Design a protein around this motif. Structure first.
Motif, PDB file in Angstrom:
ATOM      1  N   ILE A  26       0.805  -1.214   0.000  1.00  0.00           N
ATOM      2  CA  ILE A  26       0.000   0.000   0.000  1.00  0.00           C
ATOM      3  C   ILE A  26       0.839   1.266   0.000  1.00  0.00           C
ATOM      4  CG2 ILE A  26      -1.893  -1.176   1.144  1.00  0.00           C
ATOM      5  CD1 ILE A  26      -0.996  -0.134   3.743  1.00  0.00           C
ATOM      6  N   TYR A  27       2.137   1.161   0.268  1.00  0.00           N
ATOM      7  CA  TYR A  27       3.025   2.315   0.284  1.00  0.00           C
ATOM      8  C   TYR A  27       3.846   2.451  -0.988  1.00  0.00           C
ATOM      9  CZ  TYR A  27       2.048   2.526   5.293  1.00  0.00           C
ATOM     10  OH  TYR A  27       1.431   2.617   6.517  1.00  0.00           O
ATOM     11  N   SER A  28       4.386   1.350  -1.497  1.00  0.00           N
ATOM     12  CA  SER A  28       5.329   1.386  -2.603  1.00  0.00           C
ATOM     13  C   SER A  28       4.682   1.176  -3.963  1.00  0.00           C
ATOM     14  CB  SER A  28       6.416   0.329  -2.392  1.00  0.00           C
ATOM     15  OG  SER A  28       5.987  -0.937  -2.855  1.00  0.00           O
ATOM     16  N   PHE A  29       3.360   1.058  -4.032  1.00  0.00           N
ATOM     17  CA  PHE A  29       2.687   0.709  -5.272  1.00  0.00           C
ATOM     18  C   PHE A  29       1.607   1.722  -5.608  1.00  0.00           C
ATOM     19  CE2 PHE A  29       4.021  -3.801  -5.933  1.00  0.00           C
ATOM     20  CZ  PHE A  29       4.210  -3.691  -7.290  1.00  0.00           C
ATOM     21  N   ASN A  30       1.544   2.094  -6.878  1.00  0.00           N
ATOM     22  CA  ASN A  30       0.374   2.783  -7.394  1.00  0.00           C
ATOM     23  C   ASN A  30      -0.823   1.844  -7.295  1.00  0.00           C
ATOM     24  OD1 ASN A  30      -1.617   3.992  -9.199  1.00  0.00           O
ATOM     25  ND2 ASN A  30       0.058   5.265  -9.964  1.00  0.00           N
ATOM     26  N   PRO A  31      -1.956   2.291  -6.749  1.00  0.00           N
ATOM     27  CA  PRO A  31      -3.083   1.363  -6.552  1.00  0.00           C
ATOM     28  C   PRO A  31      -3.572   0.711  -7.831  1.00  0.00           C
ATOM     29  CG  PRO A  31      -3.679   3.647  -6.035  1.00  0.00           C
ATOM     30  CD  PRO A  31      -2.197   3.592  -6.112  1.00  0.00           C
ATOM     31  N   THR A  32      -3.442   1.375  -8.975  1.00  0.00           N
ATOM     32  CA  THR A  32      -3.898   0.817 -10.239  1.00  0.00           C
ATOM     33  C   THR A  32      -2.839  -0.025 -10.936  1.00  0.00           C
ATOM     34  OG1 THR A  32      -3.529   3.083 -10.994  1.00  0.00           O
ATOM     35  CG2 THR A  32      -5.796   2.303 -10.872  1.00  0.00           C
ATOM     36  N   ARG A  33      -1.674  -0.213 -10.325  1.00  0.00           N
ATOM     37  CA  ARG A  33      -0.684  -1.134 -10.863  1.00  0.00           C
ATOM     38  C   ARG A  33      -1.107  -2.558 -10.536  1.00  0.00           C
ATOM     39  NH1 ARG A  33       2.487   1.387 -14.679  1.00  0.00           N
ATOM     40  NH2 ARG A  33       3.042  -0.527 -15.802  1.00  0.00           N
ATOM     41  N   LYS A  34      -1.314  -3.368 -11.568  1.00  0.00           N
ATOM     42  CA  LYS A  34      -1.795  -4.724 -11.361  1.00  0.00           C
ATOM     43  C   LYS A  34      -0.704  -5.582 -10.734  1.00  0.00           C
ATOM     44  CE  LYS A  34      -4.686  -4.906 -15.442  1.00  0.00           C
ATOM     45  NZ  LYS A  34      -5.298  -5.901 -16.364  1.00  0.00           N
ATOM     46  N   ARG A  35      -1.079  -6.354  -9.721  1.00  0.00           N
ATOM     47  CA  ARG A  35      -0.160  -7.210  -8.992  1.00  0.00           C
ATOM     48  C   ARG A  35      -0.623  -8.657  -9.075  1.00  0.00           C
ATOM     49  NH1 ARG A  35      -1.261  -2.437  -6.560  1.00  0.00           N
ATOM     50  NH2 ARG A  35      -1.900  -3.428  -4.599  1.00  0.00           N
ATOM     51  N   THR A  36       0.266  -9.559  -8.676  1.00  0.00           N
ATOM     52  CA  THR A  36      -0.021 -10.982  -8.633  1.00  0.00           C
ATOM     53  C   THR A  36       0.439 -11.544  -7.299  1.00  0.00           C
ATOM     54  OG1 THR A  36       0.606 -10.946 -10.971  1.00  0.00           O
ATOM     55  CG2 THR A  36       0.012 -13.072 -10.017  1.00  0.00           C
ATOM     56  N   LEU A  37      -0.404 -12.365  -6.683  1.00  0.00           N
ATOM     57  CA  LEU A  37       0.012 -13.084  -5.491  1.00  0.00           C
ATOM     58  C   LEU A  37       0.960 -14.213  -5.873  1.00  0.00           C
ATOM     59  CD1 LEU A  37      -3.177 -13.350  -3.269  1.00  0.00           C
ATOM     60  CD2 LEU A  37      -1.767 -11.390  -3.839  1.00  0.00           C
TER      61      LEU A  37
END
Lengths: 106, 251, 173, 193, 132, 204
Positions: free
Chosen positions: F126-137
């Motif tokens: 939540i700190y190092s990422f743009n919220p709209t940057r898609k991530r993967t678990l």
RNA sequence: AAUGGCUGAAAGCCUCUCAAGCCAGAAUUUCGUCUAGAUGAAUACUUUGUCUUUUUCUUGUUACUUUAGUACAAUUGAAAAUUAUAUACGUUGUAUUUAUUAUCUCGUGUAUUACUCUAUCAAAAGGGUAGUGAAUACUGAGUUAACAAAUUAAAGCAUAA
RNA sequence: UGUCGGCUCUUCCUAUCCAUUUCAAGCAGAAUUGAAAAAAGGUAUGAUUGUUCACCAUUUAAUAGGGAACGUGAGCUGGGU
RNA sequence: AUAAACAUACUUUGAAUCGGCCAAGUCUGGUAAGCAGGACUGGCGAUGCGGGAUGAACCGAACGUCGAGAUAAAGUGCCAAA
């Protein structure tokens, strides 16, 4: 009985990318996160206390210590430089060191 | 440079390393997928290859050009005397694979089963399962057995019975039995353990496991051949007669 | 960035010794400001340092560095294609701050380093003269926006621990 | 460019109730219930009373606000609003996609199961293969007239996709599709009421 | 909907700098990242200055009739009308700031008493809760 | 002194590489680490992007003998161990001893589920990422590449939540009753001398 | 995957998406199945019940034998989820190592405990029930302290598996 | 640093000849032509020539192009040089 | 103007060497080359050290044995000091 010391971690020797100077040891004191909280500990006593399993027929002590002083900070993150009577053994990297409250100035 | 002409590679890379097993019996690497909406049943057996003969069978398939008087086909005879169920083991699905939780064994264990636990029977004291049998009916051991049943019914997903053959029913000179774990496929874990409990010390025949005209899988160890060259191991082409130092090798 | 008011004159047969040249040069320090001043005289009036002599070089401070003003900066920058004249608008309280904004903005948006830009002029425009699509939305009298996804603020580097206890959270702030 | 506030709203009619729980909108109407999760980390969905007419009174709306955000991320405000608008229409006057069968020589017979949750396509271009396209939940197939079927449902995304599934199961292969105009096509899309 | 906004008149709390844990009032918004805060210098002590939004925190108080570029003379008048100082001291943040000031002037003897007393009170309160 | 305790890091809502960098530094500072739920860590990029990266990783293999070649572990706990090992000294006793103090498990096993959990603010997504940057678990990527125990961890985690839901419900009831009994003692007439000290220093 | 599509903005229309969200689609990928295989697990028997090293017997292992040294039950470490998080609050501002008022004795009961042990029902539980002790609160009083002191080694082979 | 080719054998590239999935045509069908995904599987027998190459006769779903010290001589052969 | 007395001017006797190679806000032949040949200077050869992960020539800087400090090139998520 009581705690009169602060755990400082023997981070390593004052070094560069490829060289290393064992005359000065870099300690990371617990609770000191910036170089501006370092002035208290400049000049304090530091001991690396270690245990040796001596034999019964030997008169050498089971507990030995190497004493030194904190002399200067190292960077903006509360790491300090310490000088000891004998240079610390690099097998003690990551071990804990005792930072005492003397020579007191309070 | 490229090879002048193309050909399939000799041998299969799906069977490398090419190393001989140690035990004669081959453990099945997997069992048929479990279905939870059917009655409990056994999904395997254990037999001995007697040999081969040939038969003539009538063809029942339609729209085939096979002769109406039968087709000669080879068959393999596998002698399967009834097996004795000596116990069962529960398995749990962990994050490292199936893990056996506990194993429950019957009161009476045959000497063929006991021989599996030693490497020199005639020099042994032959007291395998002796303490287990002696205090089988003790109240302290009865409660431990019931807890083992309860533990499997709560924290297990796979139940397998421990069945062994009766070597006195086959002409083999061996007296030590062959032990196999036969997985139970059926209802819930509660009714799978009940099925295995009722199977203790009973004899299971091959007709209770396999039906009529049923296609099955067979796992066994191929006939040994010892040290062999590349012509027989893989099937490479033999070199010309003119070759110095030999013909039956890869150039 | 700092302002300086620089005056000088040329004493030679080509320039009368009554013409005084003024400028208001932005530079990190007065040595750089003088160098910028002398390049203008040489490139526009054929006046060289050896043939001229400086008169004044004194800092200029903002009269009221507490009032927000709309600064319009006129500048020319050299690109690969050629030289272009660009007008940019910034909001700030000091002239030097807005010029510092311009240099950082041009270096990022146009990839143009400092030694390719010449600040022609900088004036103050009215409220409704702002044409920047993004800056225009903060010029009105009812600008209001909730700042979300806040990172909690550490009071000082003293409390900056590497590993914390419990869970971490953002703030609707 | 970035917009300080990009906002959209949808109007909740008389017989519709909406509850929003962390971008999980559940619209309830006379024709049933509908739920959808809008997992966009930059939208704010809430219900409020707003004047939509130039002079009319306040009526209940669902406001979808997105603050500072580029044009790439601001495009979802109207997308979410239109999805909620479609969900409102689907539970008041449900959607209906009518389909027609086109063939030149080989007649196509459609076998619809009694529940209507599946269809069978037979004799398509004389092929021996039979297609048994199934339908999504809440989508029902019925035969209206000769060479005509329709799909009823409360969810436009499921009704339209089920229609696309029927068409995509009857594609002509290795032939001129400009000459072989065979298949099941969506004649028109309308509302049940 | 969001409850706290960056607007003119919103009372903000400085988190870092020489004026940390001091109240302030936004008087003009420069852009999305910077605002002008003039939490009355005659009252709180925060001078009229430009601060990045990363170094403040919004509170639930908005001073009424505060306009853009409100003078320090008039801002002080409106700051004391809503009694922002009185109201802020009753909030969780207001008591959290006051506690930290109280704790930082505790010597060794004072910390000794609290640990002794708090241990007994907490243990006594545990005894008073029955286990049936 | 000696650090006999274990620092348990909940890898939920964290970034794989930023967690590894902080842990690999502290492993060299003598600390003992356990990273539970090393399958809930997040990595930048969609699943399609991550799978392409995996395929490039899977290509590195000794041509003459793949059994000598790089071993590409699919378990997310082994994905993290690979990341942490890359940030530790290579081929010396210092880096081997540091890696002996680290463990991930795909969930929370028996001893570590009732320990105090920690968080790394530098590595929080939540700190190092743009919220709209898609991530993967790491778990979702692990299943796509052949991790067989994805649903075993989900089952074990589901049991863990329901056991902690009633432990927390029961403990809350006790704390509410204790807090009330503390209010009667604080307001008690005979405890005035003790309470006066507590209020004077802001503890009451 | 290429591709063909659904819903749908940007961009009031349109659009398979250099947007969010989905569907169908390869001799494709991953499970499933096949071969080798690491750390492992269960049970059977032999033991052992605070602990090791050096010798030494045996083809080898384990138990075992001898002289010592060493510790002695009792406060140890858990919300979950979200992060544009229903409202409200922002609860600010030091994670581990590292939160006990010196020691012992005297005084009566109650209460409490993720405390110890026993019994039982259970159980791959920081479980239930009963009892016991330990620690703490109600909650005391008294004695004493001055110099000093406050982890494994070395040897064997009778018996048993 | 044993200098050509062939025999033998493994592996790699795709700028794909076949088989699989797609789009376009001056695609009615059939046969074709241009292009995208895709290198996991296939890609032959002979007359003449030492030949690589070449050119013919067939067969095939196709009889694609190349690399690895112009792969490969304590692997062969020794026709060429 | 500045510098220059361990300055300046040398005399005699003699060694080794005259295969060179590199850089470039340079040039010629060549399509071009880690090609051939040149003008000026600095280098490597003859040279280690800190940095560019590795490197004859790049950048910083040239070396008696050491201690403590400020630094150069260049760096400050971990390996790796910040």
């Amino acid at each position: 009985k009581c705690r009169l010391h602060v755990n400082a971690v023997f981070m390593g020797f004052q070094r560069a990318q490829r060289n290393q100077y064992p005359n000065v040891a870099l300690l990371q004191i617990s609770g000191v996160n910036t170089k501006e909280d370092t002035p208290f500990y400049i000049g304090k006593r530091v001991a690396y206390v270690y245990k040796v399993n001596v034999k019964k027929g030997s008169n050498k002590p089971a507990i030995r210590a190497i004493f030194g002083k904190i002399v200067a900070p190292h960077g903006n993150h509360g790491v300090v430089k310490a000088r000891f009577l004998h240079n610390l053994p690099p097998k003690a990297m990551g071990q804990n060191l005792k930072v005492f409250l003397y020579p007191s100035n309070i | 440079s490229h090879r002048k002409f193309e050909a399939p590679r000799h041998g299969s890379l799906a069977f490398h390393p090419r190393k001989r097993v140690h035990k004669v019996r081959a453990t099945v690497s997997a069992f048929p997928k479990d279905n939870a909406a059917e009655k409990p049943h056994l999904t395997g057996f254990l037999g001995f290859k007697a040999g081969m003969t040939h038969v003539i069978r009538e063809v029942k398939r339609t729209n085939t050009k096979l002769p109406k008087d039968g087709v000669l086909e080879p068959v393999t005879i596998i002698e399967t005397p009834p097996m004795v169920v000596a116990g069962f083991v529960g398995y749990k699905k962990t994050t490292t694979g199936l893990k056996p939780i506990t194993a429950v064994f019957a009161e009476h264990i045959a000497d063929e089963f006991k021989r599996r636990y030693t490497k020199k029977w005639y020099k042994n004291t032959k007291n395998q399962f002796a303490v287990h049998t002696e205090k089988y009916n003790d109240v302290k051991a009865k409660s431990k057995r019931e807890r083992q049943i309860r533990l499997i019914k709560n924290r297990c997903d796979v139940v397998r019975v421990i069945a062994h053959t009766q070597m006195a029913l086959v002409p083999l000179k061996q007296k030590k039995a062959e032990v196999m774990e036969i997985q139970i496929n059926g209802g819930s874990i509660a009714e799978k353990v009940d099925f295995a409990v009722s199977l203790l010390e009973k004899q299971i025949s091959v007709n209770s496991v396999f039906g009529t005209d049923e296609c099955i899988d067979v796992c066994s160890v191929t006939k040994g051949h010892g040290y062999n060259g590349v012509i027989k191991r893989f099937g490479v082409r033999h070199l010309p007669r003119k070759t110095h130092r030999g013909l039956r090798k890869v150039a | 960035m700092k302002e300086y008011y620089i005056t000088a004159r040329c004493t030679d047969k080509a320039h009368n010794p009554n013409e005084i040249f003024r400028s208001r040069v932005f530079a990190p320090n007065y040595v750089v400001a003088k160098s910028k001043f002398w390049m203008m005289l040489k490139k526009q009036h054929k006046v060289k340092k050896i043939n001229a002599e400086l008169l004044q070089c004194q800092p200029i401070f903002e009269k009221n560095p507490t009032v927000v003003k709309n600064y319009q900066i006129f500048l020319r920058y050299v690109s690969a294609g050629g030289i272009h004249n660009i007008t940019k608008q910034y909001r700030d309280v000091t002239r030097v701050g807005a010029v510092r904004q311009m240099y950082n903005d041009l270096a990022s948006q146009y990839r143009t380093r400092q030694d390719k830009i010449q600040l022609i002029s900088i004036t103050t425009v009215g409220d409704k003269a702002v044409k920047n699509p993004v800056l225009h939305q903060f010029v009105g009298h009812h600008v209001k926006f909730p700042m979300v996804h806040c990172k909690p603020v550490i009071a000082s580097k003293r409390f900056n621990l590497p590993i914390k206890a419990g869970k971490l959270t953002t703030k609707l702030c | 460019p970035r917009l300080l506030k990009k906002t959209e709203h949808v109007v909740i009619p008389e017989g519709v109730n909406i509850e929003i729980n962390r971008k999980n909108i559940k619209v309830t109407g006379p024709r049933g219930s509908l739920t959808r999760e809008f997992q966009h980390p930059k939208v704010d969905i809430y219900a409020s009373k707003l004047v939509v007419k130039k002079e009319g009174p306040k009526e209940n709306v669902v406001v979808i606000d997105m603050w500072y955000g580029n044009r790439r991320d601001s495009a979802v405000v109207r997308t979410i609003a239109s999805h909620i608008k479609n969900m409102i229409t689907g539970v008041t006057k449900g959607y209906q996609y009518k389909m027609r069968v086109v063939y030149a020589h080989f007649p196509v017979t459609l076998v619809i199961a009694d529940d209507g949750k599946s269809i069978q396509v037979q004799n398509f271009l004389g092929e021996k293969r039979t297609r048994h396209i199934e339908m999504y939940d809440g989508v029902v197939v019925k035969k209206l007239g000769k060479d005509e079927i329709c799909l009823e449902g409360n969810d436009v995304e499921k009704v339209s996709q089920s229609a696309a599934n029927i068409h995509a199961a009857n594609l002509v292969r290795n032939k001129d599709i400009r000459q072989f105009l065979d298949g099941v096509y969506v004649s028109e899309k309308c509302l049940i009421e | 909907v969001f409850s706290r906004f960056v607007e003119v008149g919103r009372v903000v709390l400085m988190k870092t700098g020489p004026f940390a844990s001091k109240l302030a009032v936004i008087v003009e918004i420069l852009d999305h990242n910077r605002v002008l805060v003039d939490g009355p210098q005659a009252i709180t002590g925060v001078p009229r200055q430009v601060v990045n939004l990363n170094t403040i925190s919004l509170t639930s108080f908005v001073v009424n009739k505060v306009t853009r570029g409100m003078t320090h003379k008039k801002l002080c008048l409106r700051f004391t009308q809503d009694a922002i100082i009185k109201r802020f001291n009753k909030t969780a943040t207001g008591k959290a700031i006051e506690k930290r000031i109280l704790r930082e002037k505790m010597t060794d003897f004072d910390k000794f008493q609290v640990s002794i007393i708090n241990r007994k009170i907490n243990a006594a309160a545990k005894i008073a809760v029955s286990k049936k | 002194s000696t650090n006999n305790k274990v620092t348990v890091i909940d890898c939920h809502g964290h970034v794989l590489g930023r967690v590894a960098s902080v842990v690999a530094k502290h492993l060299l500072l003598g600390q003992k680490f356990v990273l539970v739920r090393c399958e809930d860590l997040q990595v930048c990029g969609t699943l399609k992007m991550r799978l392409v990266q995996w395929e490039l990783y899977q290509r590195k293999r000794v041509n003459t003998n793949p059994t000598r070649g790089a071993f590409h572990h699919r378990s997310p706990a082994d994905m993290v161990r690979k990341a942490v090992r890359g940030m530790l000294p290579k081929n010396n006793y210092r880096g081997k001893l540091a890696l002996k103090n680290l463990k991930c498990f795909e969930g929370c096993p028996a001893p570590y589920d009732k320990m105090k959990k920690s968080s790394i603010p530098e590595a929080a997504a939540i700190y190092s990422f743009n919220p709209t940057r898609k991530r993967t678990l790491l778990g979702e990527l692990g299943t796509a590449v052949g991790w067989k125990y994805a649903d075993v961890v989900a089952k074990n985690e589901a049991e863990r939540k329901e056991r902690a839901a009633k432990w927390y419900a029961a403990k809350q009831l006790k704390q509410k009753a204790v807090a009330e009994a503390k209010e009667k003692i604080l307001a008690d007439e005979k405890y005035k001398a003790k309470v006066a000290i507590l209020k004077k220093f802001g503890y009451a």
